[PDB]
Symmetry: D2
Subunit: 440 residues, 4 copies
């Protein structure tokens, strides 16, 4: 699936539509980042810049100029074609091909931005700029504005109003188009296959990073070159640590392994979590905790629909978790009272859902306590979980169990579509999947 | 193979040995780096900081204090243990375990560095600091020195001399110890196995990124989680681009594919390049260019030894290349006359060798035109190559051919040890290898 | 004459009147400035900050908050009263007295601005800030906005719109109130008396700086402690240099001395220039150049009235100068022809007038080529001049003559009021003033 | 008196003498400073830059290059001669005249410093730079060093050692040469005459700033254009405030007036304080406090000589003050016990002496608690004082009295020379001086 040229064009026009007449919006590309000495990390374009261009080069700036409600044009600043620096540092789009390729009216050399930007801003009333996003961008913008302010003798004037476009653009990204849903649907599929593969390849004795290897290879063969975030593979006590990326321990027979991994496909992120027994067979204790988490997820998947909210659904999940924990003796007391005092937090300390899109923890206003009413087009995760520390004062057989199950969904007119249901989560289906894989 | 505790201790003492009495050396860890929004790239420790600690955490500073020719001690600044935040930011070493684990005399919370550093520098004559390496480090150091300069009323004095320790430390890293050679040897084997696998899995129709996937999976299964640089897989015309990391094209029958990839094992880098026929059979034209590059490599591998230099060996390679190109009609004229003319540069535009170590393009002084005399312990690459542009005015059949063959060697008392010879490069051996793999 | 506390309140309300509802304007005080090592220059408050407060302390910020068309209040950030430390630095207003003294609703310690500013901006739609005016101010503002942007979980929101209030405030300062005119009138008198004294004290043999001394002493005895700009005293060839502040040469008999000096009274500037013979008697050549400049000034003083412009009057002065220069043989050719090619520029290279107010070169839009139509309330200078280089290719006697005559005027309903006519400029009156000065 | 060309040359060589071979010292001029909008404060050169050049222009850098123990040369970077920018911003030395005028071997345009500095530092082992002195200078130096570090392919190398030359240079400035003593002697005379004049002009009813005016006019007529620090004129209760520069109150009959003012002559500072009765007659109470301060000063003037220290002499003064205060009933108890508990601090809270030179609070190491042994050539002030708050719990008649008497001395072979004894301080002499001023 792909984001078409028509769509990129459409997004720009949707932004211009909200801009005041006599203004310009400046969107900067992300800077290259050093990994060590003279080597850089694989380039990752700025999500907002990507959203409007699908252009994967640094040192580029998109300038949308709105003259009035019926006239507007675009100018792109990007690296010049250097049939010398390209033979040495990869191909560049250049100014000649850019107009047709990216659908912009004009393209200029990034090396000329300081001599050209102020001329584009001269006389405008408003400039839309994400101040503070990038230092190199603020230098360029401030430099241009200063030049205009001090150039009255050259008949230059600077726009006195600067508006951060992030709130507007992020509200746009919060609602996915059909094209975006198709791409996210594919990212979910690819991510699901990777998780399925991890469960099938897992064997006691293997190291956590081995499953990471399986997952990344699967992402890659489907065209999703990079993960959308650092892969987590925590078996045993490591599963109780939410930010466990070391993936250095040997997986033991009898332990559970929690895997949170997602690919980045065409810029969009997949975000799946599956927890399963390293030896392919849930013990009674593990199965008891798992069922509570699964009930939470299945219930949430049933509840999420237009009209409700993350906060509301979270309330249902808290009740389910407290009830379950009381039944097992992990929590003692009256359910409603325990809920009233959030007695669940020691075991479920993170949110149930977060937006998903060009960023795994996507942009968009959540509302106080994530109470914003859900509408069709919003994409979010559903990731309930229970983590019982090795030293928690609870029945012995539950200590050291970390479980999380996470799916990605898109809100629809009548409810929601689960984009990652293609990888099993029911305990019996997991054990059957692993058994089938093991007889080879 | 790995680096022992004794070795990290040995390196610190080797640096202290060169420091003037009454001084302190400050070595900062690398900052965490943003990939997008709130997600970060997998952490990569600063090579120099790693060299002295093998500690993989950010917000850490190693302080080596030399009182006199016989008395010196160490202080480490690192993140505090937060048994209520490590659940969200992975496990941390902390101050209690650090002394024993890292072999430092004392450990303090990084959060206290501004209240403690100046006290450590107070009264010293010299401070060794890599000014300009990291902005956050310069802020900390300058802040401490300023506090001392302005604190005469508190009996504080700042060292007036600041020395950059990079030249000294890099000269140290230039000569590998037996332990380092063992680790680099393992990195070479792992990298070789990945390249072998790539040749065995290659089939027309597969995408360039597919081989990248095979390679990274192989690195990973051997414990080398990350590549030491971005993998290059350029088939057909892409092979003529040195910095080709897009790896997006479908590999066509009849084209060659150039693969430059290396793993990062225990911090050290492998760096291998192998070029081979996508269809497992070198055409005549491809084989003719290949032989010139292979001879260049094979000869260089015989020449490299103590007493010669990269510049000297490069001279031999230039002869070999010019001769070969003249015989094929790519170059026309007298050999010696063409050499004097560097008529080879349009086809071989990069260096023959570069140091190798904690960084793929390792630190260390090369001397003018890389004329420094080689000695035992130095580790370098040997990577001759020929790239004939698709539009080069040469015999038609050679256009669009990009070939490079690269091995990693360590200079020994009597010559050199090839660390990457475990992956074939002989054209017959390559074709035979691809044959034996395709029977399955 | 002074600025009443009622006027400061009036100015604030005039700014608030133009602000959008749900916004806040931030006006920062000027930073203290180092003269050398630990000594500072006498403090000079930021003109705009002064305009709204008349408060002469650094580390102070005026915050005007407009809730709606009828509700608005003010908050002042300023240094705290350090009863046990002011014994060292200086009496400070403090928070208790500020409200009644400065007429602000509330006052807070400047040391708490980072903990309070964001709370004041939280939830507003617009923030008026002079970005780029002061580094320390931008740090404070950006820090507060960043805190709001990243505090959605604390229900904090940052105003997305930032407007530079300078254009609005400067347009306000361009039109002087009756109170301001009274103060400027006094500044003009004081400055005039100083210039009169300089002419009366001048004698050959005295140094240029001696006249500077006379002038500053006169400013001071009338309560105008500091000059509004660096005093210029250029005799002989020094008069041909516009920015001559060395005032180091001995004044020779037969030379003219040009004096440009103005006091700063209650924040407002006087700006007068008078040129006269050091020996009290104009030489024929000097008198001939002087008359052209005087005619220019006299005609301009006659012309300036509502409806015309600096550009228009300048045109008249150019004709007068070209005509005069042709008659003396300094310029050769047809008057209109010479005018058309600006043949006057080598001798008159600066503007005829500039706004005057809290800054000698006051704020306010001039319009292209200073063509803005003049209206009552505008205060400007009238300073024609002619400078004939010592090596100018003109009749020998005129070489080395630098003359400028400048007065300060305020545009009125029927014309303009000359605020500095109390110091003579008619050549006869100057010579009479000087011979009579001696008579004692 | 003035500093000769030979002395500037001498100072440079004295610095070069202490530099290691193969190094360069960089000394930057002070930046111009904004007073308001586009107007600047009168330029004040950086004391250290001035010390080696006597050059009063900004955007200039002195580079002293030491090749070996016998070879060294100098390069000056300064503004270029611009016949236009000069007619507009004053005359400039330029490159042609600089060599001869400033006694430097070569001069280059400041506008070319970034293209030239690194070439001068290339290959050196040490660079002497006052890091942190000026931001613009650190930018230039860091930029040059970075260029060298990254230019190994161009055979460039950066000096790894950076030494702060301030400690060395300030130790030099601490010992005045004969020429400097002559200039400081003249500064003292000029300052003394100004103070004498202030006493003679003082009359009840006059404002504090009026005396300031008299003082500055006196400084000026002797060629000392600017004060070395902001003039203090505190009468009545204002005298109890050490940093009282408002000088805004009307001087009352019956009050004392404390005047601390000093001129800046040829870069050197005078620093005198005299306190006297506004009405020319000391009261019972005022005279009693005055005598204690005078005794302190006279005793210190006797004591100061080579071999003692500021700390030692301070001890004597403390005894004198405590004894005196006990006799008047301001302090109650045993002298020695009171001294042991510093019961004098509430009335004498500042130091007795500070170095004096190119800066009023001159550079140079004081030693712990200012215990450094005094030697011939050191110049310091002697300024004992007593300040009794208006609300101090002491005999009512002493409340609100602020008195300080300060002279400037130079340590000699046998004792010290008082540079400011030409202005009276004995109470009888003060009253007599003021009387001989109201002559009819
Ligand atoms: Mn996840
Ligand atoms: Mn998630
Ligand atoms: Mn390579
Ligand atoms: Mn290589
Ligand atoms: Mn003027
Ligand atoms: Mn003027
Ligand atoms: Mn003083
Ligand atoms: Mn003093």
């Amino acid at each position: 699936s792909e984001i078409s040229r028509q769509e990129f064009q459409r997004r720009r026009q949707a932004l211009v539509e909200q801009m005041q007449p006599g203004s310009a919006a400046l969107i900067f590309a992300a800077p290259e980042v050093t990994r060590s000495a003279d080597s850089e990390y694989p380039y990752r374009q700025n999500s907002d810049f990507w959203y409007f261009t699908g252009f994967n080069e640094p040192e580029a700036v998109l300038v949308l100029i709105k003259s009035d409600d019926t006239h507007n044009h675009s100018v792109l600043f990007n690296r010049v074609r250097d049939l010398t620096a390209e033979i040495w540092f990869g191909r560049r789009l250049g100014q000649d091909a850019a107009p047709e390729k990216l659908g912009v009216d004009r393209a200029l050399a990034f090396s000329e931005i300081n001599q050209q930007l102020y001329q584009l801003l001269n006389g405008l009333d408003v400039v839309y700029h994400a101040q503070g996003e990038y230092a190199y961008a603020d230098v360029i913008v401030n430099s241009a504005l200063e030049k205009l302010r001090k150039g009255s003798r050259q008949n230059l004037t600077a726009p006195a109003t600067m508006i951060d476009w992030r709130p507007v653009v992020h509200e746009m990204r919060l609602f996915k188009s059909p094209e975006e849903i198709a791409v996210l649907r594919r990212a979910g599929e690819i991510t699901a296959m990777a998780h399925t593969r991890a469960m099938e390849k897992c064997r006691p004795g293997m190291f956590e990073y081995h499953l990471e290897g399986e997952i990344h290879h699967e992402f890659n063969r489907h065209g999703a070159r990079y993960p959308s975030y650092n892969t987590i593979v925590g078996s045993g006590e490591n599963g109780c640590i939410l930010h466990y990326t070391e993936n250095e321990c040997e997986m033991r027979d009898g332990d559970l392994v929690l895997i949170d991994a997602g690919c980045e496909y065409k810029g969009y992120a997949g975000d799946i979590t599956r927890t399963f027994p390293v030896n392919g067979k849930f013990t009674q204790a593990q199965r008891e905790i798992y069922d509570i988490v699964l009930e939470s997820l299945e219930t949430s998947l049933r509840l999420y629909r237009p009209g409700t909210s993350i906060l509301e659904v979270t309330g249902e999940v808290v009740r389910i978790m407290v009830s379950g924990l009381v039944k097992l003796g992990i929590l003692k007391g009256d359910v409603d009272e325990l809920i009233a005092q959030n007695a669940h937090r020691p075991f479920f300390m993170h949110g149930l859902s977060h937006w998903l899109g060009l960023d795994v923890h996507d942009v968009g206003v959540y509302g106080q306590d994530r109470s914003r009413i859900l509408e069709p087009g919003m994409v979010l995760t559903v990731e309930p979980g229970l983590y019982i520390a090795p030293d928690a004062e609870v029945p012995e057989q539950y200590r050291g169990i970390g479980i999380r199950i996470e799916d990605d969904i898109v809100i629809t007119e009548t409810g929601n579509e689960n984009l990652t249901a293609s990888v099993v989560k029911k305990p019996e289906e997991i054990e059957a999947l692993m058994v089938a894989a093991r007889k080879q």
